[PDB]
Paper text:
One of the first steps of tRNA processing in nearly every organism is the removal of the 5′ leader sequence by ribonuclease P ([name] P). In contrast to other [name] Ps, HARPs consist only of a metallonuclease domain and lack the canonical substrate recognition domain essential in other classes of proteinaceous [name] P. We determined the cryo-EM structure of Aquifex aeolicus HARP (Aq880) and two crystal structures of [name] HARP (Hth1307) to reveal that both enzymes form large ring-like assemblies: a dodecamer in Aq880 and a tetradecamer in Hth1307. HARP structures in additional oligomeric states have also been published, including HARP dimers from Planctomyces bacterium and Thermococcus celer and a HARP tetramer from P. bacterium complexed with Escherichia coli pre-tRNAHis. These data all show that a monomer of HARP is a VapC-like endonuclease that consists of a PIN domain-like metallonuclease domain and two protruding α helices, which are thought to be responsible for substrate recognition. The active site is conserved among HARPs and PRORPs, with five negatively charged residues, predominantly aspartate, positioned to coordinate two catalytic magnesium ions.
Molecular replacement revealed a heptamer in the asymmetric unit that, upon generation of its symmetry mate, produces a tetradecamer (14-mer) flat cylindrical ring consisting of a radial arrangement of seven HARP dimers. The structure was solved to 3.2 Å resolution. Notably, the dimer and tetramer interfaces of the 14-mer are fairly similar when compared to our Hth1307 tetramer structure. The angles between dimers in the 14-mer structure range from 48° to 54°, and the distances between the proposed tRNA elbow binding region and the active site ranges from 39.4 to 42.1 Å. Despite the additional dimer compared to the dodecamers, the Hth1307 tetradecamer maintains a roughly 42 Å distance from the active site to the proposed binding site. The tetradecamer presented here is the largest oligomeric HARP assembly to be described so far. Strikingly, unlike all of the dodecameric structures, our tetradecameric structure has no helical features and is instead a flat ring with nearly identical tetramer interfaces throughout. Experiments using His-tagged Hth1307 revealed a single oligomeric state of a tetradecamer (14-mer). The ability of Hth1307 to form a 14-mer in vitro was confirmed using native MS experiments, providing evidence that a 14-mer structure is not an artifact of our crystallization conditions.
Numbering used by the authors:
A (entry chain B): 1 to 104, 123 to 191
B (entry chain D), K (entry chain D): 1 to 108, 120 to 190
C (entry chain C): 1 to 110, 119 to 191
D (entry chain A): 1 to 107, 123 to 190
E (entry chain F), J (entry chain F): 1 to 105, 128 to 189
F (entry chain E), I (entry chain E): 1 to 106, 128 to 190
G (entry chain G), H (entry chain G): 1 to 106, 124 to 190
Write the structure that this text describes.
């Protein structure tokens, strides 16, 4: 039975969520409905779910979302990663900060200070996503191309996020 | 099938128990009834159950409650925790004591004497709550269970150490979808 | 050769340090001098040495002390303690916070400002009971890791050390022990 | 026999190097001379040595330095660090970026580059931090550093430490 | 399926056996009947069963009892307990005897030699419970507090009938 | 080099201490002096040393004693004993209580046993320490050394302790 | 399913075999009959079966008995017993002979005393065989001899009252 | 350096002790004297030393003997012997008693026959103790009893001719 | 399900094959027919089957026989036997040679032993195969089954083979 | 230092012992003298030494011999040989006896019962050599060819004196 | 100290042995003399030594040679080689047989009969040489020794499988620098 770990970008990037509906809230609702009738487990890291809720107001959808998408933390005890992964994470932080810095009087340096604090949060989400995907042996669904490139050098299973609805449909119990 | 370890706050904090009914005994009895018809195991550490019985008089409910919610002790023999966990526990005691000390101070010859006994009850309960926290975490770890809490402090420790969690406000909803 | 882990109390409790000299700074300086000519390794946890520097001002003694007493952190990686040590610590915490409350109140057994001064002396008591509990863990873990003899003076810590199988000495005989190991 | 892993700050922060000489190039030279007669091993990560050379021109000292201080890379092959360490590293990056900008903030076109530079050096110094810790862990060595934030981290992880102000002193008490 | 290890106290302390019947022999008889029709294994240490028979005369009930409640010895070969457990046992002996002599008011020499027999029962009970991963059913506060320190599964003995019924 | 774990009865039973001197305090003092020159390690469990101090007032000898005979606790962390040893302990408690009860039979019944428990806890501490250090158990108590024999702990005649100490410089 | 290892005494001591029938060969035949319709495995050591056959003639029953009661040797190849067990066996030899010696006390006196201890060691070798086989198969020892059952208990072998063997077999069909 | 485990028979059988001196207590004293100046460790099981003391009074010599010959118990805690060894011990009991029984054949007849087999099992328990201790220390067994030495050989314990013990000790000073 | 390793003597000793039929070839044929319907695996070592074919001419029965009783070699690669078994083998050779020598004593001395060696090699092949498969050894030879007993291999009375086969559909 | 395991053939076959002396008792005597002054351990299996004493009467040489040549049994507990070795032993027995009867020309029954005694010696020799990691000294072609198949260290027995001398 | 395993070709190929002297027996005896005063162990497989004795009559030299060059058999009991090695051996037999077949052909009613016996001696020696090669490699591996050969074919197999090598022409020089 296929397990998936979802990124923040799955429901915040329009290129991905448009497959459910053009509205954000409507796409999320459609996803939740479909997730009930599909033979799949969905997961999302605690940290990622937190940032998703800061961006999108789910309200009455939250409990249904939390029922179909299990929110687990990847911080297992005694989990060890090889030293190499540590060094690759450093490169991911570089990517994240510099990407945020590109998109940025003194609203250029409280923009800039906000960009790097977001860049750290995005990196701590990336590692949470990968670790959880690794632990569950799950398929990582993510609109962030930079994350997906890293999930490959590390050998995590992937899907084209644009085909998530399609995949889900062809697995209905 | 899903396993849950319940904290004391599941049935003592109104924000959580109101999903079952509006009376404490009503909520407990509604929970027990539903637990019978749900495909799930429930557990509560011995220490947590003890404090729960001091705060609430179950009476005739106790045997039914003890049947649906299994009371186990998490004090395993060959169990080992990393030295990290030990240091994290010290921070939880700090959190517990200082939160309990805030609430003593705020309520605030004769006024000096009610304040000393109010600060002793703040610390002693702060330690009791910290020992319960550990019991809850260890049991959750051992059974690979979903910790149902409500005490934001505990839930955030549970998260640091990778224990499974749920929003306690959605407990009834989850139970209803596992019948 | 013998290895020792030192508590704060070895140089702050007068019943212990008098063996070197009657003054505090004099006792510490005398200890350092003797430690140089003794065939023994001395250690103190980073957390404990920090509290020792907050209570006593070593000044020019610091570098000599830091040479004879090695200041190491016991927070090794993958160190695992059994789960019973977790519960025994919960109990030391209790003993500690309580001993302190005792002195807070018992010291304050003694306008309305009285209430605020009592409020502080209670606050200070728990904050220092948690600092002394963290010290206690640090001391035991360091003693365990090095297989060292714990020199304390604190009854509460030594009782715990004994429960967990850590080697102990009478702190009052430290100078004597050191003298019978000269190189 | 004692082993030490040196940080850049040992020879770039004056508060540390003054124990050898007031002069930077003289402190380094004095250190090198003493290291020859000291019963100790010295090490410095490859990345750390690279940054040290970009700040200080050693010239004819380089070969003597490279003989007394062995320049090794900690990027071993089967090394596994706990997942926790990974999260600790993220916090170290936060500390170093935020320390860099606090410096930057104080001194429009010059500001955008003073802020790029703040965080590119912030990442480089975080990579140096990891290199230093991993090498210290691998060799079971005593980490000598002037940076507070690195020395604070070397404690959470249990790496052996020294007051850098006492380095000369320690070296002298080992022949 | 839930396994259980029974103490002597289950059928000798009236507070516990009254749930089956007011009569002692009738409670045992009722328990055995119910045990047949419940999806649960029952066990009792050799040493505990011996003392139970010295106190209660079962007569024709014995073979039915021995069929529903399996009598095993916990003395498996190569079983190792942590040194800590050994020290905790010493404390249990202290508890057992001190209680016993309170009760003295030749009756000192019986309060000792019974206090140790009760201690040997306690160990046999805990070890068997540990080995089978069973739920310890016991009236005795002291045994149940020790069982808890060592992480053995417990039940309120007063709800034994109720639990059996719901299986 | 030879390691020894000492019981309480080494310095509290006259049959054993007479080899050092006729006086108790003098035998202890003679032992301490001889221990300093001897090529052997001496040890005594914490619990055993405590009871020894309650019986004998060492005074100024305590620091010299605590230098020659090292007072360790045998309650090591990951230590496991076979379940059989646990059952052997129960028999030792019976031996100790019944011996203490015979002598009582002339509050002296209540403390005939409370001492019997303390003596049994000491016995365990002595055996475990002996096991851990792979040491020779020196004890005058018959019952303890007969147990020590069942569990394969090395033994000596306590009456020959001085002689053995002398044959090791 | 339950497994049992049988002693000689289960069919030679009258106090146990009377549960099947009053006559010895009749009891054996009833047992065999019942064992066929029982949901249980029966075993007896080779050495024990040999002495059983030297005491009872059996004849016609032998092939039926050998079908229901499997005769195995417990001398497994890599079996290790604790040194302790070795000492315990010396005590069992003592018990076995000194018993034998009580009967004898009731030339021929020598010829009775020699015969007493030679049968004593044969019975000791039976005891070992029985315990080892019970251990190997994790079987319930059905004996009748108190001394063997006391030993079996110290060693933690599963036991039953031999007087209830028929009853147990009946409740497993 | 060479290690030896001694039997009772090394100082109770005259055929062996005569190499030291004709008198028993004189031989023991010479052995003790020589053992002091020998580069070799000597050992004897607790059970063996006990029976040795019940046969020879010794007295004055005891502390010197206990210094040169270390009296250890071989009942080590985690010792495992193969099941095979257990069977071999049953044969040793047989040998030991049937021998004992030959002497007896030469009331009192009973009191001689009881005494014969009680000493036989005591000697069997000695044999085990000796072999186990020899095994544990990797020591050379010095016996005098042929039956024990035959066993020691089947088990692969190191052996010496007891008649050459003095000679061996002399060539190690 | 039950597995059996068969010796040569199962079909070459009349005391054993008479249960199937009075004729040799008829007993073998009856056995093969019964084996097909029985819920049991049969095996015979390669070496044993070779000698069986030299003694009895199976003709058209061979393919049916080789279908019901599987002919395997027990010379597995990483197989190790304890050194004791090696010494036990030496005693088996002595038994086999001396038995063959008694019967010889009436080139019949030279081949009294050469057969004794072949029979000893067969014995080893039989035991090793039985050990490997955890099979029940069926053999009429007294000496072999008494060895099989010493080494803990499962056994049956060969006289009851038909009866056992019948009680397994 | 080089350890050696000696066969009977070392002191019973004249081709080998002639290097010490022409006389048999003198060769043994000479060997023992040299053995004392050479930096090498010597060993011989129990079974081999027994047969050696049945053939040669040593008398007063025995204790000196037993001091220089340690007589151990190879029957260590738990030693395992590969199944292959077992089959190779069968072949050795075949070799030993077949040789033996050639020689027959009651003398058939002795050529067998000696052929097996020689086989049991062969195993004892190889196992001891294996256990000690020793050099096997043997006159017998057949034993030395087997020793070679199993990877045991060998020497030419004719050069034994020479090797001892250079140590 | 350095250990060496010698091939048959060390003393039979002149290009190698000429470093010691110009006569075969001269070279062997010079080698033996030097081997006595060098801090090095020498070994040769039993099979290799056998073939060496067939080709050269050592006589009185044999005991001295056997003392300096230890003749061991590499047929270890628990020794395992990777299945690669097995396939590589087949290629070595191909090399050996085809090299030996070339030399038979080249030398080349009566001519047919000397050619059949010349092709049988080419194969049978080709197998003998292949078994020697394996013995040499296995012994070298077991002792972690330096293979001294000269047979270019063997040296190139030895290299594929990571055995230590030396130029055989420098053997004397190496021995001289280890005195």
């Amino acid at each position: 039975m296929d397990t998936f770990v979802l990124d923040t970008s799955v429901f915040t990037n329009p290129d991905v969520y448009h497959q459910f509906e053009e509205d954000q809230l409507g796409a999320i609702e459609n996803f939740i409905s479909l997730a009930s009738h599909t033979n799949a487990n969905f997961f999302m890291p605690t940290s990622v779910y937190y940032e998703f809720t800061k961006m999108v107001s789910l309200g009455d959808l939250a409990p249904k979302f939390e029922l179909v998408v299990r929110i687990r933390s990847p911080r297992k005890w005694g989990l060890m990663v090889p030293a190499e992964f540590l060094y690759e994470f450093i490169e991911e932080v570089r990517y994240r900060i510099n990407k945020g810095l590109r998109i940025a009087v003194n609203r250029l340096r409280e923009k800039y200070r906000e960009a790097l604090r977001a860049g750290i949060i995005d990196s701590k989400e990336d590692v949470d996503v990968l670790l959880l995907s690794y632990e569950l042996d799950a398929i990582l669904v993510s609109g962030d191309e930079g994350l997906r490139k890293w999930a490959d050098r590390v050998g995590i299973k992937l899907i084209d996020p644009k085909n998530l609805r399609y995949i889900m449909e062809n697995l209905t119990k």
